[PDB]
A = this chain, B = another copy of it.
Amino acid sequence: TFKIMSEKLKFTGDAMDVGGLMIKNVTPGTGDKDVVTKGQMEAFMKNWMENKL
């Protein structure tokens, strides 16, 4: 962990990682691929295209 960040040497705006942070567990904050699934549930099941639409 320490050695890899040494070659970075540019972390000034906090993390600024070159990856995509492909891991997270829960919360409406950092968004995983479930945001798209969450969006279509809100759009179809309960907000826009409700039952009998």
Name A10's closest neighbour in chain B (CB-CB): B23
**Would you call A17 and B19 a contact (CB within 8 A)?**
no
- Nearest-neighbour CB distance to chain B for A25, whole angstroms, equals 7
Chain A residues proximal to chain B, CB less than 8 Å:
1, 4-5, 11, 13-33, 35-36, 39-40, 42-44, 47-48
Contact B21 A30 (CB under 8 A): yes
Select the residue from A1, A21, A29, A31 with max chain B CB neighbours within 10 A: A29
Is the pair B24, A29 in contact by a Cβ cutoff of 8 Å?
A: yes
Q: A20-B25, A23-B16, A30-B30 are in contact. Are A47 and B36 (CB under 8 A)?
A: no
Provide the residues of chain B in CB contact with A33, threshold 8 Å.
Answer: 28
